[PDB]
Amino acid sequence: TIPADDIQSAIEEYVSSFEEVGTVVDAGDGIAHVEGLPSV
Amino acid sequence: FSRILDVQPRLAILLGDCAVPAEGRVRLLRKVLERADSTVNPVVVALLS
8 A cells, every 4th residue: 555646747746846156165375166156 | 665766766866955955855755645645654754754
């Protein structure tokens, strides 16, 4: 007795529920690491 | 539930999102679970959530 519905379009019920600025985490000597910016 | 989670790992991976906040995660999760009531027990849902 398991949820064998196989209606994974229920994932759709959630997917449908869904300017980029990052932040310097460390810097020095001319190098900088930037957290964020998922689409660079 | 581990069986049905592994055999179609799409749902497994879309639950492995590290950076994404977990409120939508648990929403999605319980929701998919109590989509059917073959999981009458709620404490399983509490554990997994």
